[model samples]
Target: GSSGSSGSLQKEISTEEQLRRLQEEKLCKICMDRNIAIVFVPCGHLVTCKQCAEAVDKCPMCYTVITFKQKIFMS
Candidate 1:
C-alpha cells in the first residue's frame, strides 16, 4: 500500500511467468518427463527425449528423415 507497489507486483509476475515458460521449453514434447536431450540434424529440431529420439526416425516438426541424431547436454 505504497508508491511503486504496482511496479513491484508486475516485476514479480513477469519473473514467474518467464521461469515457467523456460521449464516448458526444456521438457520433451514426446515424454514430458525427460528433458529435451536430442537435436535432429538437417531439420535442426530439438523436441524429444533420448528414449523418444531413439524410437523415432523422423522429425516431429518437419517430418524430415532424421539423418543424424545429435545428443545435447543441458546445464
Candidate 2:
C-alpha cells in the first residue's frame, strides 16, 4: 500500500558524508592515494596502488600471470 496524503520521496545527506565517499572513490581500489599507479600487462587494469603493486604477484581481476608491473601517473 502507498500513502495518499502529502506523498513525497526524498533523501539527503550532510556535506561531511559526501566528502567521505568522494575520498574513498578517489583512492586505489586494492591498496589504500593508496596511488592507483600500477597497470597490469595485457589486460591493462590499473587497480593497484603504489605500495601494493610491488607486492602483487598476479593480476587481481583475472588472476593472470603478472609479466610486468608498470607505475602510471593518473590525470
Candidate 3:
C-alpha cells in the first residue's frame, strides 16, 4: 500500500462543513461582483445574485432562456 494517493477537497473545507455545500465554487459568474444566490431552473444554473439575476434575460452559463428564478438561502 505504499504507492497510493488521493485527490484533495481542500478548497471545500470552510463552507462545505454544513449539510450540503450548495454554494458555488466562486462568486457570481456573470459579474463576479456578488455571491450567487439564485437558481435558474430547467437549466438550474446558479449564476448570480438577486440584483444581477433580475437583469439577465438568459443564462450566461448555457445561453438558455431564464423564465423564472428562485432564491437560495445560505450561511
TM-score of each: 0.64, 0.60, 0.58
The digit string of per-residue lDDT tens for model 2 on 29-71 reads 8765575777887677777776766677778887877788877
Instruction: Give lDDT for model 1.
Output: 0.79
Please report, as a residue range, the 10-residue window in candidate 1 with the lowest summed lDDT. 4-13
Candidate 3 TM-score to native: 0.58
- C-alpha lDDT values of all predictions: 0.79, 0.74, 0.72
TM-score of predicted structure 1: 0.64
Off by over 4 Å in 2: 1-19
lDDT for model 3, on a 0 to 1 scale? Answer: 0.72
Stretches of model 1 off by over 4 angstroms after superposition: 1-21
C-alpha lDDT of residue 55 in model 1: 79
* Candidate 1 pairs with clashing backbones: none
After superposition, candidate 3 runs with Cα above 4 Å error? 1-25
lDDT of 3 by residue, 34-66 (tens): 787888867877767777777887877777888
**Candidate 1 on 22-45: residue-level lDDT in tens?**
877777888777778788878777
Model 2 poorest ten-residue lDDT run: 26-35
**Backbone clashes in model 2, listed as residue pairs:** none
